[PDB]
Amino acid sequence: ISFHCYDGYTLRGSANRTCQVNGRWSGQTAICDNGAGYCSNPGIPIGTRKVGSQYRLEDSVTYHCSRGLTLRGSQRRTCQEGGSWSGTEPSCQDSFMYDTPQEVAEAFLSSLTETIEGVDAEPSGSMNIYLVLDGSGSIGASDFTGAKKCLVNLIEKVASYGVKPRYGLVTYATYPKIWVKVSEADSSNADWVTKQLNEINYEDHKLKSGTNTKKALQAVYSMMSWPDPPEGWNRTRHVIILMTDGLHNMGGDPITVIDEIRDLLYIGKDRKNPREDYLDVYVFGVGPLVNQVNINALASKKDNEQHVFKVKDMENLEDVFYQMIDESQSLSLCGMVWEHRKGTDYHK
Amino acid sequence: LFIQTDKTIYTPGSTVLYRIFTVNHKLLPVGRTVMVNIENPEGIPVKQDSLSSQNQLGVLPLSWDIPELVNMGQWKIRAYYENSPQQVFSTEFEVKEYVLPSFEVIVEPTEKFYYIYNEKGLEVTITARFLYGKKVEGTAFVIFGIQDGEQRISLPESLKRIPIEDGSGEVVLSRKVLLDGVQNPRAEDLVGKSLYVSATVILHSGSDMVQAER
Amino acid sequence: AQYQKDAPDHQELNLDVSLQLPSRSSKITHRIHWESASLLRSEETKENEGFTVTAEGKGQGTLSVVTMYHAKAKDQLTCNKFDLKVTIKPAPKNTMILEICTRYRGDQDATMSILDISMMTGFAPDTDDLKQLANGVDRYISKYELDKAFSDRNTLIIYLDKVSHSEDDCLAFKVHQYFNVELIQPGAVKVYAYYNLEESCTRFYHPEKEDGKLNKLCRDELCRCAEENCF
Amino acid sequence: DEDIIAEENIVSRSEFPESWLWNVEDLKEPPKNGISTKLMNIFLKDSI
Amino acid sequence: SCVGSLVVKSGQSEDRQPVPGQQMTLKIEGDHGARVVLVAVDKGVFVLNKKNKLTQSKIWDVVEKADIGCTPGSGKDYAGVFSDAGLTFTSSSGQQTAQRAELQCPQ
Ligand SMILES: *[C@@H]1O[C@H](CO)[C@@H](O[C@@H]2O[C@H](CO)[C@@H](O[C@@H]3O[C@H](CO)[C@@H](O)[C@H](O)[C@@H]3O)[C@H](O)[C@H]2NC(C)=O)[C@H](O)[C@H]1NC(C)=O
Numbered sequence: 001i002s003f004h005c006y007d008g009y010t011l012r013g014s015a016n017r018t019c020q021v022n023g024r025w026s027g028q029t030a031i032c033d034n035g036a037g038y039c040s041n042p043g044i045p046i047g048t049r050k051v052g053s054q055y056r057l058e059d060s061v062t063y064h065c066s067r068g069l070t071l072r073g074s075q076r077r078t079c080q081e082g083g084s085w086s087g088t089e090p091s092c093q094d095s096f097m098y099d100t101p102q103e104v105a106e107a108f109l110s111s112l113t114e115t116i117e118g119v120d121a122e123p124s125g126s127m128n129i130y131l132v133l134d135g136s137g138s139i140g141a142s143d144f145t146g147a148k149k150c151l152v153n154l155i156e157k158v159a160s161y162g163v164k165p166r167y168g169l170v171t172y173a174t175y176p177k178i179w180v181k182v183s184e185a186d187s188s189n190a191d192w193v194t195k196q197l198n199e200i201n202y203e204d205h206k207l208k209s210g211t212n213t214k215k216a217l218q219a220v221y222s223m224m225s226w227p228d229p230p231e232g233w234n235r236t237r238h239v240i241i242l243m244t245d246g247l248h249n250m251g252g253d254p255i256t257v258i259d260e261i262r263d264l265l266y267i268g269k270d271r272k273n274p275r276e277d278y279l280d281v282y283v284f285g286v287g288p289l290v291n292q293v294n295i296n297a298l299a300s301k302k303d304n305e306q307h308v309f310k311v312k313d314m315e316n317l318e319d320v321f322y323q324m325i326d327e328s329q330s331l332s333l334c335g336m337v338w339e340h341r342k343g344t345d346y347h348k
Numbered sequence: 349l350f351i352q353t354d355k356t357i358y359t360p361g362s363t364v365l366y367r368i369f370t371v372n373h374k375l376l377p378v379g380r381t382v383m384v385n386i387e388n389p390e391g392i393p394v395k396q397d398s399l400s401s402q403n404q405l406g407v408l409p410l411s412w413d414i415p416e417l418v419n420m421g422q423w424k425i426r427a428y429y430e431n432s433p434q435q436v437f438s439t440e441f442e443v444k445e446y447v448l449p450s451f452e453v454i455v456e457p458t459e460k461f462y463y464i465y466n467e468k469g470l471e472v473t474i475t476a477r478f479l480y481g482k483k484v485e486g487t488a489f490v491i492f493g494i495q496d497g498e499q500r501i502s503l504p505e506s507l508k509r510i511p512i513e514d515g516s517g518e519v520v521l522s523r524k525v526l527l528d529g530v531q532n533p534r535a536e537d538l539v540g541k542s543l544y545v546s547a548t549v550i551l552h553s554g555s556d557m558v559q560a561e562r
Numbered sequence: 563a564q565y566q567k568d569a570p571d572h573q574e575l576n577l578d579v580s581l582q583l584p585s586r587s588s589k590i591t592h593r594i595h596w597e598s599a600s601l602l603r604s605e606e607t608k609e610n611e612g613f614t615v616t617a618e619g620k621g622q623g624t625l626s627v628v629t630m631y632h633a634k635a636k637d638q639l640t641c642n643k644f645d646l647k648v649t650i651k652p653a654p655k656n657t658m659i660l661e662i663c664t665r666y667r668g669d670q671d672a673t674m675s676i677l678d679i680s681m682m683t684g685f686a687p688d689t690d691d692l693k694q695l696a697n698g699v700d701r702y703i704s705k706y707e708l709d710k711a712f713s714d715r716n717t718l719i720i721y722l723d724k725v726s727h728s729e730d731d732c733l734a735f736k737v738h739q740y741f742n743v744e745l746i747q748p749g750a751v752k753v754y755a756y757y758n759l760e761e762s763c764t765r766f767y768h769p770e771k772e773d774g775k776l777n778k779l780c781r782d783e784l785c786r787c788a789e790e791n792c793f
Numbered sequence: 794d795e796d797i798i799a800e801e802n803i804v805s806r807s808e809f810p811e812s813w814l815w816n817v818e819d820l821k822e823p824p825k826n827g828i829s830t831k832l833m834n835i836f837l838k839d840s841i
Numbered sequence: 842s843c844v845g846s847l848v849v850k851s852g853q854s855e856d857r858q859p860v861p862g863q864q865m866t867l868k869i870e871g872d873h874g875a876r877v878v879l880v881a882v883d884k885g886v887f888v889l890n891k892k893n894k895l896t897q898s899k900i901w902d903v904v905e906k907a908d909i910g911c912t913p914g915s916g917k918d919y920a921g922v923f924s925d926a927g928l929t930f931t932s933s934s935g936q937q938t939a940q941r942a943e944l945q946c947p948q
């Protein structure tokens with residue numbers, strides 16, 4: 001199927017698109033814009049419906065998916081100052097679309113590495129990575145062990161950049177189980193964290209195979225919290241990565257915790273200083289049955305970035321991460337400007 | 349300069365698609381610089397640009413986005429060559445909240461005028477058919493009135509309710525009610541004045557209602 | 563002759579107006595010139611803050627700030643120039659009586675009006691009673707609507723010649739239940755003049771549900787449809 | 794019931810524009826009798 | 842009428858009427874190398890407003906209502922026939938046409 005724009009309108013995005021075997025359209029979304037607004041036309045991803053034609057500043061739009069389809073990304077986007085829509089581009093998902101291991105690893109890293117190149121400004125040890133693994137009986141030992149191996153190579157992949165972040169390892173079921181705490185003197189020791197990632201097993205949560213994700217995120221909360229104003233709090237990037245099927249049945253809505261976390265990090269609580277770049281949440285669907293609606297509600301929504309992933313075969317991610325380790329590629333440093341206290345010109 | 353707009357009336361929130369044709373004093377394509385303004389109903393410019401039909405073959409595709417919170421009324425698209433600010437071309441388009449009807453209504457009198465001493469009166473035909481050709485089944489409310497100057501005088505006595513069978517109707521204005529509409533004994537004083545018809549068809553389903561006028 | 567060259571048409575028109583909003587990081591700078599004068603330059607803000615404006619340069623301009631919102635004026639209760647009262651009662655299948663009273667809010671006996679009625683799903687007007695009202699003075703019902711039978715007369719239009727602004731011109735007719743089914747949909751009645759459609763009044767009738775409304779849990783201004791099973 | 798089409802396999806209409814076909818066409822076809830002719834294959838909307 | 846020509850007929854072999862969501866051919870007979878800008882409008886729109894429609898008749902209307910000539914023919918003299926028609930006759934013998942200052946015709 002091909003797209004064409006009326007007169008006076010410019011076409012950006014794939015003009016021709018082909019229906020592929022993965023139940024997805026090839027190329028990028030077609031958008032017919034006139035470039036007459038503060039922000040450009042967000043466009044209408046195939047399968048969705050946009051409600052909002054005004055693209056002024058402070059204006060907004062809303063997206064809805066057809067019946068039987070699940071919306072991935074943001075359902076509402078607001079035109080922010082500086083010409084840039086909030087959240088991320090929506091996408092109508094079905095019940096068999098999945099994601100190829102490469103696609104996942106490719107997008108997960110193109111979003112992670114960037115939020116690390118900036119971390120170099122400059123133990124230690126100025127980024128935290130909370131690994132929350134789901135050990136519920138609804139995942140099975142197969143899709144669980146494959147999730148660890150994937151994490152292992154991820155830690156090595158990160159390490160290949162020569163960066164030493166603080167790690168926090170937690171597996172959860174009916175109750176949360178903390179293996180590594182960022183406050184530990186060994187959290188920044190990649191090898192340390194890896195040895196733990198190996199000692200854990202799927203049989204660890206067999207006696208009480210609940211799925212209380214809420215308490216799991218509460219475990220992470222207590223790790224980033226304070227006993228009541230550490231000197232280095234408004235300079236630390238927090239990254240939460242959790243594997244789950246999104247099928248929680250104990251504790252209620254886990255999202256409430258995410259909000260509490262954002263309140264703790266003073267995020268989205270200042271018009272002039274959003275501080276969104278200080279918290280990223282990645283959610284990987286692992287179990288046989290995965291609720292794309294719930295894992296999308298936890299994952300972050302950042303423009304041009306993907307935080308929700310539904311691994312097809314899994315285990316292949318592990319082999320992809322290992323293949324994507326390249327010590328030759330350097331870590332960028334261009335166009336970097338951080339709000340330092342003194343802020344003398346030439347710092348800006 | 350000739351300005352073309354896709355529609356004749358737009359709803360708040362839609363976009364106006366218009367084109368400017370740049371021809372010389374011989375009606376031929378030419379590359380020129382054109383100024384374009386957009387005046388609100390009260391005649392105040394809200395947007396102005398400076399385009400050029402250069403390398404465009406005397407055709408300037410354009411568009412204007414109508415705000416959700418816009419002013420209802422007759423908007424205006426004014427334009428002119430940069431080397432002739434005095435000679436200004438313009439085209440109007442109406443902005444209003446509405447919904448497209450399902451059928452049209454036509455009111456054609458037997459004659460394109462009216463003879464004063466015509467005892468028969470003014471016979472008017474009421475043709476109403478759906479947009480897809482089919483004929484309308486419903487009722488019609490037709491009324492008359494007199495217009496002399498920029499001022500109209502309704503004739504409450506000339507109210508009729510004729511049925512619309514097979515997409516057709518028939519109503520007549522008795523000469524009695526006409527002369528009785530005014531009060532002036534003379535009938536030659538009506539000479540020069542004009543009459544107007546106001547029809548209203550309504551389907552038996554009561555789902556749609558169209559208003560016409562001649 | 564020299565004075566005819568050094569003679570200006572107007573005075574300098576070069577305003578550098580900049581408005582800074584607290585909810586915004588950068589200033590909004592505009593420049594008004596003689597040629598570009600009388601130009602509507604608006605900046606919208608979905609947020610209600612106290613912003614400041616700074617003007618600078620040679621000339622003169624006009625500033626105007628107007629906010630648009632929805633006021634809780636109501637009040638109305640916008641039934642307009644009509645007072646429609648509809649009631650559905652049993653009978654002495656399950657025949658019922660539909661009494662429809664109507665009045666006009668004005669100084670004149672409202673001209674020709676319309677009566678759009680929608681039956682309850684599974685109910686149809688008594689043909690006999692319709693004929694009686696059709697023949698009645700100041701009442702007319704299209705012949706097309708008469709000879710329909712219980713086949714499909716779920717929508718009826720009873721045109722009127724007038725409705726007194728004094729008392730209520732109440733009328734009624736029987737409605738038999740030709741088709742039985744659980745959960746029936748409330749009917750409705752709408753009145754209005756032949757010239758103005760907007761100004762009108764509509765009411766709903768239902769055997770059980772009061773004033774023909776659907777069950778919905780309301781609170782302040784947030785309501786949720788409660789038309790489902792119990793547990 | 795037993796017959797008719799499933800109320801799920803019914804693809805409802807939706808595209809009801811008040812105006813469309815705002816495109817451009819050039820006549821470069823082999824000119825015969827000074828009358829070039831193009832044959833456009835357009836898709837009608839859902840509107841009746 | 843049009844200096845050249847432009848026709849828009851159906852490409853279909855007559856047949857019956859189209860169906861919502863169907864392909865139909867659109868034959869266009871115009872001048873060579875000419876650019877054709879199109880536009881489709883629901884007739885339900887003209888029911889509310891049929892004014893300001895661009896028509897060829899309206900085009901010539903503007904062209905004709907701009908002639909430099911006023912009088913339908915002839916004048917009060919020789920130098921008048923020219924000015925009234927839209928011409929300025931001038932010779933070396935002395936006979937010249939009247940002076941024209943106003944852009945638009947008198948009255
Ligand atoms: C979307 O699809 C269309 C259809 O292919 C693309 O337009 C096409 O552009 C190609 C490249 O010029 C043309 O290919 C031609 O194929 C014929 C076959 O005999 C050959 O003789 C020519 O030498 C040429 O290779 C093709 O004619 C043209 N299609 C048209 C004009 O109908 C278009 O580029 C695509 N949009 C994208 C992906 O940007």
Ligand SMILES: *[C@@H]1O[C@H](CO)[C@@H](O)[C@H](O)[C@H]1NC(C)=O
Nearest residue numbers: 233234235273275339340341
């Ligand atoms: C903490 O970091 C924020 C980053 O926005 C900075 O603005 C602030 O000045 C810092 N606090 C202090 C006390 O300097």
